[PDB]
Amino acid sequence: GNHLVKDGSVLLTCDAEAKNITWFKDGKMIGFLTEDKKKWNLGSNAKDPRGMYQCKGSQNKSKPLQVYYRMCQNCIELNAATISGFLFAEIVSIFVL
Amino acid sequence: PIEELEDRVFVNCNTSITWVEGTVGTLLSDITRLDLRGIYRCNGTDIYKDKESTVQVHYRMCQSCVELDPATVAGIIVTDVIAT
Amino acid sequence: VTQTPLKTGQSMTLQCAQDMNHEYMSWYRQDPGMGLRLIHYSVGAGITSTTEDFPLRLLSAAPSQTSVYFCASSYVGNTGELFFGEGSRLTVLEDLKNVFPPEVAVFEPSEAEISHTQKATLVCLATGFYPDHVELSWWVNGKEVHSGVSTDPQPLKEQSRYCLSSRLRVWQNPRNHFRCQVQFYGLSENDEWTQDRAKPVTQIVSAEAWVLSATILYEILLGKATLYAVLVSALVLMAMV
Amino acid sequence: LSVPEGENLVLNCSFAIYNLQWFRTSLLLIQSSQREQTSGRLNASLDKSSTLYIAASQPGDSATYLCAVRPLGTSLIVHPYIQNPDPAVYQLRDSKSSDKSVCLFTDFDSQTNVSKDSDVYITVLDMRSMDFKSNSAVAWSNFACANAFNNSIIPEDTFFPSFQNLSVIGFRILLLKVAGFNLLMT
Amino acid sequence: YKVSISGTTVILTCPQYPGSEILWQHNDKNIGSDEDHLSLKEFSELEQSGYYVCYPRGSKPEDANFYLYLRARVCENC
Amino acid sequence: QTPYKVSISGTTVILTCPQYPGSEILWQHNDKNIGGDEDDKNIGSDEDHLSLKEFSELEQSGYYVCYPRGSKPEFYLYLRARVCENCMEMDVMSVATIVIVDICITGGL
Amino acid sequence: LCYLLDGILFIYGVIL
Amino acid sequence: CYLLDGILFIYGVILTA
């Protein structure tokens, strides 16, 4: 059903034929891949690679894909144990007033 | 030649080793096998008898490496120095 | 040898290609852990279209298949080496209420374990999803790991619900960081499903436990200090101005 | 077959053949009339009118083997030698969003292999990276393991209890200095 | 799609296909969801990271023209 | 026996076969020929080397062989590293040089 | 399994 | 972290003092 685009490193595979794989970044040509490769480099999934990507071969193009990731600006587990830590750190730092 | 140990520079050999010591490493109870730039060589006989096979390797995978852009790590190293 | 890449009764096509001009070319299915069985071979056009691509196609997907696949090629008689390639698994679902995207759980050992054996054990658990078509693959360092891993093909029925577990034993370099995954060849995008309690597509799930979230929380503690430290260090610039 | 590591291993597969291969992938390959094949560490003496040999076995060799025939599987378990069995049971830190607890039993001896309660489920780890191998098993449910690992005869000396990563190793000194300004400004 | 950072409850908007009801093919409504919005509370990254998409009313599993993949976790204050 | 020489720098991976004083230098990797062609740009054809640009740390890892021309498959290399597109190998040997050079330059500062 | 030791680090910085 | 195992003996210097 189309949708040719699908450790911590994240790579996308285009299921097109092995003659041309072409990658569109944010709707524009950004790179070209050879036949010996089968994955597109996004890097570590933690390095905020958020965007909309889509691949093209000899055909027209496939269904566009989009994903979002972050450098963990909101990545927490706030139990009372960590509550003690961050709360005490805050109060002792601010006690300078 | 070399087989999988998920993080190791371990070498799969059927005969003793010949090596250059840039680093010492450690060998298995089976002295033919070695774990840890330095040059470390294996030496085989089973189908090469009257001759030898040889392997020199870059360390298999990485127990101590990470995928990264140094630019996207340079500043995160420079944090502790700008904090000085 | 290369290989790429389901409601009951659905159909699908499998592909395997070679550049070795092999004439003896076949397919192979493996019952995970105990058995491997074969599919008939075709030597050329007209008998059983191109010696290169020899595709495999399903007539009717059934939950009873429950195996992985292999496509093999070789020359006839010169050496005898039946060379193999990679593989993939099937999943046929009595869908809707039975199939869910995998829920994956992974743990860390105790302090006394590491203290007394110096070499820790890590385990991942996944709750099953009717039928018994389950997968599991550990992922560290950028590869699927086969060394030092346990696998049991049957998701242990509990009452019904299921669970399956695998062990990854191993620390002087905490650069090691772990993850657990499961590959679910779920329903395709082109088969029916009622959007209430909606459809899980073929998916791969992730579980991580290496300090599971302590490191991440200590990291976020930075932004809990950096911006305000910079602000108090920069508010003096009014006097500089 | 149940042997520790380092032992000589001989295996027999029972049945003028032209094709035959011992699968771990093909390792044993027979030609039309060749009598000996040698590779890796293994021996192969052939008689079609068929042997494999491991001079010093290792638990990595433990696998299910099959023999292929043409007209004209068998599983092997290889055990470690830990040189110091240390049987022990411990509980594992249960992650959040789970209402279950898991138990572990490891570092025991070969002869000392391992539920009885209404809602507990219980189940070689040839990790050659550690230059030895061990055996392990787990039990999980809803939970102190003292009553959990209770169905099997553990010996009386069993021990009971009472990229981001790279980054987090990085900025320790930056935190030490936010510890600095927030106190040097006083 | 749009997202929010604050708290252990996460929120996202699907502006696609206004004028008709919206249905989600993955992690649809324990969970609150409006006509064009989905609200998730106590989000664990362990079992809820995967493919996401929003479908209009009167649509079949093949009609999507956009797709989303995600992996996130809570902040409780942010 | 002078060994292989493998160098990793940025996205580029190179292999050397100094085992011959001349004659011919041909490469194979995973039962296929590589480096004999030059018209393709992410690999190199060299007087003694096999060159790989943008080495796929996950896919291009395998056995590498050295050839004099005219030979048959029947000194080998098995190569694995993380090359990606900017990563190298900060092995455990240099841990101090990574994590205490900061303190040393701090003390100098 | 070091966070405890950072805890003693904090208390010792406090008493210091 | 474990870097301060010998620095855990700032307990020691106050004992001397």
Ligand SMILES: *[C@@H]1O[C@H](CO)[C@@H](O[C@@H]2O[C@H](CO)[C@@H](O[C@@H]3O[C@H](CO)[C@@H](O)[C@H](O)[C@@H]3O)[C@H](O)[C@H]2NC(C)=O)[C@H](O)[C@H]1NC(C)=O
């Ligand atoms: C498979 O992959 C590559 C992807 O780069 C294709 O190679 C090159 O594609 C470019 C695209 O611009 C071609 O540029 C040509 O420029 C001039 C303009 O006057 C003209 O010859 C063409 O109209 C075209 O725009 C370029 O020729 C092409 N080939 C090479 C060798 O550089 C490659 O063609 C793809 N394979 C197929 C069968 O398309």
Ligand SMILES: *[C@@H]1O[C@H](CO)[C@@H](O[C@@H]2O[C@H](CO)[C@@H](O)[C@H](O)[C@H]2NC(C)=O)[C@H](O)[C@H]1NC(C)=O
């Ligand atoms: C494998 O080990 C044996 C034993 O060290 C090596 O045999 C020597 O090889 C050299 C040539 O490299 C001969 O001149 C010596 O006579 C051999 N040794 C003895 C004791 O006679 C063999 O070379 C080793 N393989 C490699 C590649 O170095």
Ligand SMILES: *[C@@H]1O[C@H](CO)[C@@H](O[C@@H]2O[C@H](CO)[C@@H](O)[C@H](O)[C@H]2NC(C)=O)[C@H](O)[C@H]1NC(C)=O
């Ligand atoms: C097969 O096992 C035997 C165990 O004896 C080994 O036999 C030796 O084979 C060599 C030639 O490879 C002969 O010259 C020796 O005489 C044999 N040994 C003895 C004691 O007679 C042989 O090495 C093994 N093959 C392997 C390990 O590949």
Ligand SMILES: CC(C)CCC[C@@H](C)[C@H]1CC[C@H]2[C@@H]3CC=C4C[C@@H](O)CC[C@]4(C)[C@H]3CC[C@]12C
């Ligand atoms: C870095 C130095 C200055 C330490 C100062 C911050 C201290 C108080 C913080 C930093 C890391 C924190 C720990 C991080 C994670 C955990 C695991 C959790 O299950 C219990 C709380 C616990 C154990 C925290 C306790 C408080 C803690 C030790």
Ligand SMILES: CC(C)CCC[C@@H](C)[C@H]1CC[C@H]2[C@@H]3CC=C4C[C@@H](O)CC[C@]4(C)[C@H]3CC[C@]12C
């Ligand atoms: C949160 C962490 C990781 C970053 C900052 C480190 C914190 C935990 C440490 C660094 C320096 C410490 C302070 C140093 C000095 C004093 C004065 C003493 O009479 C009470 C404790 C107090 C106020 C400490 C509280 C905790 C403190 C602020």
Ligand SMILES: *[C@@H]1O[C@H](CO)[C@@H](O)[C@H](O)[C@H]1NC(C)=O
């Ligand atoms: C055009 O794109 C569509 C997207 O669904 C695809 O199915 C089709 O094969 C493509 N090519 C055509 C119509 O030639």
Ligand SMILES: *[C@@H]1O[C@H](CO)[C@@H](O)[C@H](O)[C@H]1NC(C)=O
């Ligand atoms: C096969 O038979 C031989 C006969 O000596 C025996 O030593 C060996 O252990 C057997 N291998 C098996 C049963 O796997």
